[PDB]
């Protein structure tokens, strides 16, 4: 139940600097799985957990 | 493969089912290292999708 939205940067360990690539900068990721309506897990299931 | 990856060139890791650094922990068998050379245009020209 813990959310962690920071959205730093997941240094990879190939150097200990702030920067982008090669730094796996971003934590989330902008390609979402959408492929509107084909292929297969194109964002259907909305998740309401009890 | 921790100085593979954090190399000072190699700028695509196209790394699946495991982590760049994961890998260097898993065992195995069989292991088979193919190459090859082609032209520029090498982007996601090796995916299993492609």
Same mark, same amino acid.
């Given at each position: 139940?813990?959310?962690?939205?920071?959205?730093?940067?997941?240094?990879? @360990?190939?150097? =200990?600097? *702030? !920067? /982008?690539?090669?730094?796996?900068?971003?934590?989330?990721?902008?390609?979402? @799985?959408?492929? =509107?309506? *084909? !292929? /297969?897990?194109?964002?259907?299931?909305?998740?309401?957990?009890? | 493969?921790?100085?593979?990856?954090?190399?000072?060139?190699?700028?695509?890791?196209?790394?699946?089912?495991?982590?760049?650094?994961?890998?260097?922990?898993?065992?195995?068998?069989?292991?088979?290292?193919?190459?090859?050379?082609?032209?520029?245009?090498?982007?996601?020209?090796?995916?299993?999708?492609?």
């Amino acid at each position: 139940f813990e959310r962690d939205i920071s959205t730093e940067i997941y240094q990879a @360990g190939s150097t =200990p600097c *702030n !920067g /982008v690539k090669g730094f796996n900068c971003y934590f989330p990721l902008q390609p979402y @799985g959408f492929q =509107p309506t *084909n !292929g /297969v897990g194109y964002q259907p299931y909305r998740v309401v957990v009890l | 493969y921790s100085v593979l990856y954090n190399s000072a060139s190699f700028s695509t890791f196209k790394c699946y089912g495991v982590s760049p650094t994961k890998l260097n922990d898993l065992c195995f068998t069989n292991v088979y290292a193919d190459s090859f050379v082609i032209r520029g245009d090498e982007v996601r020209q090796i995916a299993p999708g492609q």
